[PDB]
Amino acid sequence: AAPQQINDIVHRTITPLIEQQKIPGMAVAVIYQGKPYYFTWGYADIAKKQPVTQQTLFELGSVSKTFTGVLGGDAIARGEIKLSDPATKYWPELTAKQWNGITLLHLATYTAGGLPLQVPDEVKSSSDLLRFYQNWQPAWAPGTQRLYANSSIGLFGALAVKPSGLSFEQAMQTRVFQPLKLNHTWINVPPPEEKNYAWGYREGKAVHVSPGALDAEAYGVKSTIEDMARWVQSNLPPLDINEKTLQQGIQLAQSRYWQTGDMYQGLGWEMLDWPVNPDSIINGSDNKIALAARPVKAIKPPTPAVRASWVHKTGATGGFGSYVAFIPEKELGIVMLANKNYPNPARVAAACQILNALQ
């Protein structure tokens, strides 16, 4: 009766959402008792009437940060980094005084003291980046305010892989993607895979994410609905793989490092205690809140991953909108990929309706 029940709630929830939000193409995965169930609607390419399939690639936007968090967790477990390490330890030319006291933890969790949402578009090279961070003036002491920022976790990702001697992309492929068998997940989509790469749509124009500094670390992953379902499965408790630093790093990305309001900051992932007030995550997902500064309280030592949690992340690019959420206690989760950037609360409310019916 379970597959019939899943089909019904997914159909009755997503069909009106697509119509209300005018979404051109969408893929949904429900992870129910650890098993994935896939659903597709609409078009990856409107002009060519190419349907969304289980092999369609979507831009994950900020959901990419969950991969960066896990790769950072793997580096901790390898002994290559410590979150209490100063950021300057891995970038010694970053000598400016305001960086004294700023750690990898602060970069990973948006708590360095006001690093901006986007790296400025005029910053392109590594030397541009150095000048940007050397000249940046924090608004707050480190570890006091959370301000969501690609320039923060993006730099965390770039520094965390330095001890490996690998590029960020090589580290992600070899240490996260390949061990988890995510073989249709890319930082740079290869030419033969472009036939499955959906267009994003913004004001009715077909767009892909623009290149930018630290894009790979902060918002550059593209993936299929099947690989993202396998990503959810990999972040659920029963994961037991040969690559034990990765198994441990996944658990560390769900550690609770900071609290603000009723939410907890992990590495990439964000968490709330479950059962959760649905209005809190729906309302809190609005960018008028999610992009605003909020005071944080440190959790020392970080809370080890709590099984009774709602774990989630929204993401967007100019042309795409994504959402992933799961409940480790229930072995239950959802992935929603769309080639239009429609408002976060609509994504979260739909996910709440589906998972509440199945939990």
Number of residues that bind Cl ion (CB under 5 A): 7
Instruction: Assess 76 for contact with Cl ion (CB under 5 A).
Output: yes
Q: Is 62 in the active site?
A: yes
The partner residues of 45 in beta bridges, in order of sequence, read 50
> Element (H or E) spanning 207, and its range?
strand 205-207
**Cβ closest to Cl ion, residue 259 vs residue 283:** 283
Dihedral of alpha carbons 101, 104, 107, 109, sign = negative
Select from 76-84, 256-264, 293-301, 305-313 the region that touches Cl ion (CB under 5 A).
Answer: 76-84
Which of 96/294 has CB closer to Cl ion?
294
**Residue 86 binds to Cl ion (criterion: CB under 5 A):** no
Measured from the CB atom, the residue of 82 and 195 that comes closer to Cl ion is 82
303 is a contact residue toward Cl ion (CB under 5 A): no
User: Interacting stretch for Cl ion, rule CB under 5 A, among 68-76, 108-116, 224-232, 265-273?
Assistant: 68-76
Helix axes 64-77, 244-252, angle to 10 degrees: 120
Contact call for residue 322 and Cl ion (CB under 5 A): no
Q: In Å, what is the CA distance from 160 to each residue of 60, 146, 250?
A: 21, 20, 15
- Among positions 212-241, residues that touch Cl ion (CB under 5 A) are none
Decide: is 343 part of the binding site for Cl ion (CB under 5 A).
yes
Distance, in Å, from the CA atom of 195 to the CA atom of 56, rounded to the nearest integer, reads 9
Options 85, 128, 273, 286; binder of Cl ion; rule CB under 5 A: 286
| Closer residue to Cl ion (CB): 86 or 343 | 343
- Applying CB under 5 A, among 52, 63, 83, 316 the residue interacting with Cl ion is 83
Q: Which of 287, 306, 329, 331 binds Cl ion (CB under 5 A)?
A: 287
266 contacts: CB under 8 Å, gap ≥ 6: 69, 253, 254, 255, 256, 257, 311
Point out which span in 165-173, 207-215, 227-235, 344-352 binds Cl ion (CB under 5 A): 344-352
Stretch that binds Cl ion, among 10-18, 75-83, 177-185, 312-320 (CB under 5 A): 75-83
Query: Is the CB of residue 216 less than 8 Å from the CB of residue 168?
Result: yes
- 6/76 with CB nearer Cl ion: 76
Closest of 132, 59, 123 to residue 94, by C-alpha? 132
CB 306 within 8 A of CB 271: yes
In the complex with Cl ion, which residue's Cβ is closer, 78 or 208? Answer: 78
Q: Per rule CB under 5 A, is residue 85 in the interface with Cl ion?
A: no
If residue 200 lies in a helix (H) or strand (E), which one and from where to where? strand 200-202
Of 104 and 129, CB closest to Cl ion: 104
Nearest to 311 by CA among 286, 331, 283: 331
* Piece of 111-119, 232-240, 279-287, 333-341 that binds Cl ion (CB under 5 A): 279-287
The tokens describing 195, both together, are: 């036939």
Phi, psi angle pair for 335, to nearest 5°: -125, 130
- 344 counts as binding Cl ion under rule CB under 5 A: yes
C-beta of residue 324 within 8 angstroms of C-beta of residue 234? no
The answer to whether the CB of 139 falls within 8 A of the CB of 145 is yes
For 58, phi and psi rounded to 5 degrees?
A: -115, 150
Among 35, 82, 124, 297, binds Cl ion (CB under 5 A): 82
Catalytic residue positions? 62
Residues that bind Cl ion (CB under 5 A): 76, 82-83, 286-287, 343-344
